[PDB]
């Protein structure tokens, strides 16, 4: 709807009509971007990736893409239906699935961030690929399922999973089901923040030995490219959600949050996929 | 069937050997005759492999140069190397020409398009006396830089660095002779871990 | 002065040889084979995919019974495969991680390996103790061991990187015979079916046919223009195909002392790693650096089929003794049994 | 030192000079006869049925 109801108690009525069209067009472009990304991933499956590094990274990206697409279509379905046509018919399952898929996407971004941190801080350490895949799948899907089922089993008897017109998770002096979306999802992003900084700490390391200077500030382009590639994949743009927690009265935070996260799939395609030269060479001629 | 059990046992042994070899660095050393490679390799036929462990990390160093055959016919099997160790005899001006030729040929091969270089500058102690005895400007027609030893070493580094055309994909390093063997091992380990970090980042698409 | 006369004599001898060759070349094989029907497209399916190697498989050989297989890779070990059931029989931990050639005995007893160590290690598969052990370590080569083959269980022929072939006696351990005369590094060799004479290709675009009993260069062919990496006799033993770095598989004839055809195409620009012949010799096989093999008609110079499916450059391919299937080992540590 | 090598090369060339060569047509006919003699015994050329194919 406004797309700010994800992490805000309410959205101002003066900004909702303006931001609604932007949200709808952003989610449509995101659906298109995820469709294109899945098509190119299916076309290039098991061919570009050679080492376990590329395999794990590509599995993480494809899981994130699938979760984003399913969550976005579920959110569209939940928004397009009325709150009184099916109070428990269609929006209850829709909001359950949408929250579960958002949190699974957040935990998959956590998986990618912790994978990068582990692979950077510990240079020479080999781990079983199948065991790593199993652990990632178990904790990136089992934990969201557990939190979703406990949320749907605790607040259901009180009929406080949804409040009035909004059949998203409720707040503002009721139960506390929205803490399953505000506390973890932000915190994951917080982790994805420091890991990013960690990458920066390893992208500006002093030159080993006393070798003479190589580039006259030519690494700025590489650092910027890495930052723009890694920002949408790690979901840093969700940080502005805490801004909605801080005030929930000013429209600038909501507008920028909706604009950045609505086009999150477009950013993922442009930076995560399009900026990769290994795919640029194979896509220019095809 | 006993054949299935034999196959399973052999597969287990192969997987154990692969796990053991995954922790290996598999470095590679080059240079010229009497260019100081002995000092760099002995700090602790065809080609010889020297194995040394530092900070719980094992390195194999292959002294390529004793084959005395066509390099293009067996260099393709020297892939998957973390970096290329290179040694240059600074004192000997005559050795410099073919050292530079070998460095240019090796860095320009299609196979070594991503592997880094940890080239060393050996015989640095005796090079200071050589400059005082024989001016550097006489030895080389091109400019020799300032009369100081440090600027001469900087000029040597500069003319070594620009020979590598693949500046972006190759991150070379420069070091001089250290009396203590600990310093050379520390520098080699730091270069190897930095190269592995860069390779992991490149494989992760960050670069 | 004195050397000038020798140069002139050599030049006039070469002119006489080439004039005789041109005179004998009445008509090429391609014109004669216009009446023959084309083989047509051939379907090639990987019945088995032998996996377990951890590094690029660089050399391999087929067993004498067309069942057992042997493969060598820069990992540092030799693997014996049961091609029928994909099972592994033996895994020798070679003392040298760099192995460049492997050979299987005509009786399935000894296996030979070689590489940049310049020595040939012969291992006994059948031992009283049970554990595989190094039967022999032949040494005396100053270059890398590019190729090696067994004449029998007691005699071996090897090609080194110092322009020298050597017929070694396994029991003696010394060079029984030495063949020299190549101006470039000898990369591969193949044995005739009667094991009485063998042809070896060098890096000077010259394939030399030597006689093992005599020890002298019986014949020399110069038709290529780059390195020669593949050698394989015809099943009849009168012809042999040479693969070079120009994607031109050239078919030479021992009796004719000519070049019959040069299988090549405009699409292929890479080189050749290994070639092989079918049981009847009509269906030629070759391995290219463009990540896939190529099956040609040995009498029509037409690409009969493509064996794509390898993720890296193909290294060594070989046809069984009975011609039941063809094995193909590539640089992605993968062996495929095409049929 | 190269004089001995040149003499050895010219002696080898002279030894290879007096080697008889048959017509190319005769060798082509022999290859034709060999190819059609064992054509039925070429499992690669003629697809063997899976009943007796060990790799099928
Ligand atoms: C797709 C599927 C998948 C997805 C993605 C991938 C990732 C997963 C996970 C990773 C890994 C995790 C595990 C744990 C760790 C270990 O192991 O070890 C420890 C030490 O101890 C370490 O230590 P520290 O100090 O803590 O370091 C750091 C690490 N981290 C992880 C925390 C970062
Ligand atoms: C990494 C860079 C590029 C983007 C960072 C985006 C997020 C993580 C940032 C942008 C603006 C930030 C907010 C700016 C101001 C405040 C008010 C105060 O209570 C401190 C926290 C809080 C609420 C910040 C939380 C983190 C925040 C939402």
Numbering used by the authors:
A (entry chain R): 567 to 852
B (entry chain A): 10 to 53, 182 to 230, 241 to 354
C (entry chain B): 2 to 340
D (entry chain C): 7 to 62
Direct quotes from the study:
A defining feature of the aGPCR family is that most of the members are autoproteolytically cleaved at a highly conserved GPCR proteolysis site (GPS) in the GAIN domain, which has been suggested to be critical for the maturation and function of these receptors.
Similar to what has been observed for the class B1 glucagon receptor GCGR26, Gαs and Gαi share a common binding cavity on the intracellular surface of ADGRF1. In association with a longer αG–α4 loop in Gαs, which causes a steric hindrance, the receptor ICL3 adopts an upward compact structure in the ADGRF1–miniGs complex but exhibits an extended conformation in the miniGi1-bound structure, which results in different patterns of receptor–Gα interaction in this region. Alternatively, the cryo-EM maps of all three G protein-bound ADGRF1 structures display strong densities for a lipid molecule bound to the intracellular region of the receptor. Using ADGRD1 as a control, we discovered that two lysophosphatidylcholine (LPC) molecules—LPC 16:0 and LPC 16:1—bound specifically to ADGRF1, and that other classes of phospholipids did not. Therefore, it is likely that this lipid-binding site is unique to ADGRF1 and potentially ADGRF4.
